[PDB]
Predict the 3D structure of the following.
Amino acid sequence: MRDIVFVSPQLYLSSQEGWKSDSAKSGFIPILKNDLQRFQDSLKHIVDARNSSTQYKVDTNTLSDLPSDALDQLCKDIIEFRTKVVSIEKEKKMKSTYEESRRQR
Amino acid sequence: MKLVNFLKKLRNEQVTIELKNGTTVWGTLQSVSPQMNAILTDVKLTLPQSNGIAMASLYLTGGQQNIASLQYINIRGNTIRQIILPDSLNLDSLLVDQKQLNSLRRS
Amino acid sequence: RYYCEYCHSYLTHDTLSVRKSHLVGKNHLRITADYYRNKARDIINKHNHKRRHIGKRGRKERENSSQNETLKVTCLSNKEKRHIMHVKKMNQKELAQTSIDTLKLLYDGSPGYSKVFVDANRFDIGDLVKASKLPQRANEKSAHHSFKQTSRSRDETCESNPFPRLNNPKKLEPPKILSQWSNTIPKTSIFYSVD
Amino acid sequence: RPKHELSRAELEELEEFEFKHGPMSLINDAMVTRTPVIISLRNNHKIIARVKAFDRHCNMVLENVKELWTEKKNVINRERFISKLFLRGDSVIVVLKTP
Amino acid sequence: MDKYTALIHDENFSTLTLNVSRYPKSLAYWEKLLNYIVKASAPICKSTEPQLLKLIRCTYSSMLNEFPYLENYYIDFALLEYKLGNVSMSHKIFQRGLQAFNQRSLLLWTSYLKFCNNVISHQKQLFKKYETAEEY
Amino acid sequence: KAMVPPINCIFNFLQQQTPVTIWLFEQIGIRIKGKIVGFDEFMNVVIDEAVEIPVNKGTPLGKILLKGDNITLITSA
Amino acid sequence: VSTPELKKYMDKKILLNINGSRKVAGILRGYDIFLNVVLDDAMEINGNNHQLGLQTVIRGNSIISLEALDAI
Amino acid sequence: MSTPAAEQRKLVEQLMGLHDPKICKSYLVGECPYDLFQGTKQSLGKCPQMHLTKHKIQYEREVKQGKTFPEFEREYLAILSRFVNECNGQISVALQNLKHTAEERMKIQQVTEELDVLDLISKRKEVAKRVRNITENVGQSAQQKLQVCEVCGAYLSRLDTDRRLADHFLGKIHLGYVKMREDYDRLMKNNR
Amino acid sequence: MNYNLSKYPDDVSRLFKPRPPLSYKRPTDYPYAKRQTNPNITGVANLLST
Amino acid sequence: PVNPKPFLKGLVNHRVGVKLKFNSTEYRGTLVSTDNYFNLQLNEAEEFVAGVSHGTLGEIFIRCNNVLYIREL
Amino acid sequence: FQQFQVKACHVSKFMNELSNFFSQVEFGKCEANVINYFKREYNRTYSQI
Amino acid sequence: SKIQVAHSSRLANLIDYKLRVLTQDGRVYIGQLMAFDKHMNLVLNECIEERVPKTQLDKLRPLNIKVEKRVLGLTILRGEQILSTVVEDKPLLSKKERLVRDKKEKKQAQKQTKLRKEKEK
Amino acid sequence: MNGIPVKLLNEAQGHIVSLELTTGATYRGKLVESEDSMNVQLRDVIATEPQGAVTHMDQIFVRGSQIKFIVVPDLLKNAPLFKKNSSRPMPPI
RNA sequence: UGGUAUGUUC
RNA sequence: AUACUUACCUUAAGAUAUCAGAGGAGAGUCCUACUGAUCAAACAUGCGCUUCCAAUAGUAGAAGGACGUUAAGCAUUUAUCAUUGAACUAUAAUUGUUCAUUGAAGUCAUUGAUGCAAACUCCUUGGUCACACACACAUACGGCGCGGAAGGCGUG
């Protein structure tokens, strides 16, 4: 594998050979190759002590078509918006005509 | 002009059938489908001089005790390679083709 | 033309889009499930007894068998045998439907509980769970249940719930015993248990 | 022309016209002039016989069949004389007519 | 670029990998790193990159060699290898899992036999395996 | 993108006139290389400038009406 | 007569097997009522690798089955 | 057909200058309205002009690099405008039917009888009577509870959940009509 | 075997516990790579001569 | 541009060659007639076993079951 | 593999006990390169400890 | 096997007989047929598939033959890769008992149609 | 038209079945959606090659002509397709 | 001149 | 259950056994509770017909199996390749021998697989039936009881 390096602190903090490797050996942790200096600079003190809209909720439309699922959400969001607008217009007209009829009677 | 209707006029005829696997089947014809699915009774079948698949197909039909004697065998159409008729039957009277005669009279 | 043998309903010329939609609708599901349950119940409940073969028994077997003893036959009335067979049928069906579920509730605080036992983040059969949700196109089926889902995601780690005894667990269920043989339990316990 | 849109019950006349003036000119010539033909089959069973009938599936009735095959082990030729035969057109590789 | 190259050059993956390799016996770091690697492959199938599948196998092998007493993760990686097509590697993972407890762990025997009820294709071998589970 | 049916795939493959590698039946069969000029509904494909190479020294063949029942796979070389 | 249900294989990588070993892994672009399979970026896999052009069409007579290599 | 070989022969026979009246220009450009409503309940019957795949491939190859034809685009724009005008008339008829159903004679008589009895304590009694009149109006509107689809002009519902609505939006009529609206809006954006 | 995609309830699924998997053995016929008829069929010109 | 039926009606009266599926039977002769099921009728054909000849045949009827291709020389 | 223990014997008792052990046990069908497998497993286990 | 299969019977008359159907391979299926079609697709109840091994084939070539039997249960076999079918074993119940059972099925079906006509009214 | 066996194959959709191919590979899995042409699609597929080995596919789709047989579960032993004298309740005009 | 399936109100 | 909305669809045809003769309908076609012959189906019916139907005057046995045991029975056969390092037989992509680093998949099974052979046990089936524990036969066997299961032939 490229851009990888296998290393374990159990063989590095004990200061043994074979503490790093590039191949898949059982018991080693794979880290990145460019961050091995960041691994060596992290364990410095241990070595020093050793030395010293409300549409498409993705719950209903799961067993549906995966192809046209972008426009289907848009159509649902448009329908919800239209249903909200028709409700708002009805609520506005209900407090306008009846209010005028109350002013007339 | 299908000649399966020629074999439909061949009831109670004591024939042989060589199959595509290689088995020779000696028996009397009872009936034949228009898709040539022919049933036979009083049958003995033999694989001559080999093909181990044909020997397995010969033995695994019950009634072996390599001539195998069986009471009733239906044979599918695509497994029929050729069928040999008895020479005592007259082919000039069984191949009259009355359906073809009616089709020629209808023209 | 197409005819459903289950629902006893006809159809127009045989369209695959109509026939596929017919096997999804709820009436066909109910009729098919009830028919399979009743045919399985009939082939279980059919007591195909052997035809009896009684021969003229030997002489010395008759002088040995008619002199040993005569046993007593027990028998019950109609309502008693009806109630007993109904209790035996409900016991057989509740044993056929039950299963041991101790390993699911016994490894509940395990660090890999969300990767195997959750049955939705499972690898081999989790796509089958995520595929057919029964998407509840009726609004009443979604508005009926008002409880929590408690869907445990796969990303739950060991940092969450560090001490399993502080977060209140459940005491495990006792080993259940047979109610017909419940009168022979030791009535005196070994230790004093409070509450 | 498409096959399904020609006509109804007149396809037999077109089949006879293809029989008289198509690739069936050799099976027609053998059954009216009683010449022997050599049919090579899909399992080395070469048949020298005279044609008695024609079929759409090339199911052929053969009279005075002299058949021959070759067993390769070593090399032997085994023949058989069969009086009447009904050959399926599945097995037929090729049909040769002698002048 | 694929998901593997974006997984290398990502900023969070290096930090999680260094927090794992900094304290190897902190299991929550291992589980966060494993969940991040699985989250990096949101489709899990056989058509993904094998250069990332080898890293997943090395991560699971390092986690199971550092913590061999984890019962559920042998099941997890074994059914992961069963999802990835092969069963011989999954049988090897089950065998090393049962060896990690020395043939006396009920959950691994139960999951291995629920696995073996479909994959053995042999009746006498299933009976010998169930009798081994019976005697152990 | 969209759906491309096999008849329109072979039709675009005919319009573009790419170099063609046509496979056939197994070990008896021989892989042919050429350029497509005509086909039909039973996939009887007509090809030109045909060079045949056996399964792992090619010989020219000319113009060929290859029948349908032996055609296995078509690629653009 | 009936169109086969390959709609779920619309933009996913599949692997056809041909007659005992010829594993052609490609991306399904289209099909017919004859199981003729159009594959983009085909690849022959042997137990080695061989590339099979940009687009290809494969006869349904030699096609036995197909593995969905990509998740659905 | 009963055999697939005749179906493949039909595909070959229908697959194998260009400005001729036999070629359907709405299908030559793409998404003919006589094709998007073939077998549904809103079917127009059969297209009198012929449809072809080779001419469509030639038009795609010409529009890829060669050139474009504005006459077929103008004919498709006129056909889309006529179909959009017919669908807008159908939607206006559906809106007028909904307004007539909301303004029936017995319903308006019951609403006037409820409002005639609707007239501190008097304000609380008037608020309770207005709430009862709103409940009666909601019970009258819930007898049908059918909205109007803003795009396709069909009937919808507000209490219906999003899954049945998503099943409604995935039809031949709605996909075809949304595609025709997208084509009409694209042609009106290109023309204006 | 434990969790299903099936639309049927669990009482149907306990009745639909399927058969055990089939015991595989070694095949007897030739594989489809070797399935063919006979090669090297000689020409019919030898029958027309002798 | 072309189709197999006008190319095959125009292939009549030409020294054509037909290979079979078996790689040991190739018949090269003059084509006479061909139906819609593409049965072949040849005249003065020649057998070709693996390239080498064996003898002339004459008027022959090649079945479309065992053909592999037909070529034009 | 299975570990077997002998403890605290003289020479003749060692001979008699090993012969009585191998007269009752029945071996058979060993794997070919099982020696290298045991070497790798033994080295792996003692490298772990 | 002294069964004496019927001399003028076809597939509509051979139903519910324990067939011993042969295939192209020789993989013999033994079981009761319950349905067929034009392509001879046979469903097989309590079916067993028997073969012979390659080592037993040498002994079979000119005694005991150890066949390999696998159990399929209720299967449905296609009519393409089959060769021949015979009748191996007779069913459990007889022809008169099947006739009484068919009369009971006809009376039950007529009662079900009367129940559908009563529910339709 | 269609016939009893293709209706039985369309009957057991969503059930654990076992196929055998013409090559010798035996599949086993849950049937997704069967067709009249028997081109059947399976899920959670376990496969046995004719060489002997065992593998696992996720979503297979086999063509109907390359199938030796398929095994349905045993509760379809009793099916109304098997009834010989089932009458027909008033087909529509 | 119709069929199948699904969602609301009585 | 009524009332309404939505999603999909709205149909390959022709015919019901064959041959001969007579009559009718404006060479060809149709009909005859028209006539003779063949064939098919159903219901009855008989052929000294063909095959089978398990002791009880014992503690058995016939057919089909065990996806049962002894049985890890006895006799055989296999359990990955490549580069390099320290020697090396050596025409190979160092094949062969001992040890190892690395690289791609990597059936489980070696208590495995094949062949051989005996014993024990258990499952499904029956007329487990009516008289008697008896001296017949070269035209080899009185098939001349009540039935049942499978089949052949013949008649209405």
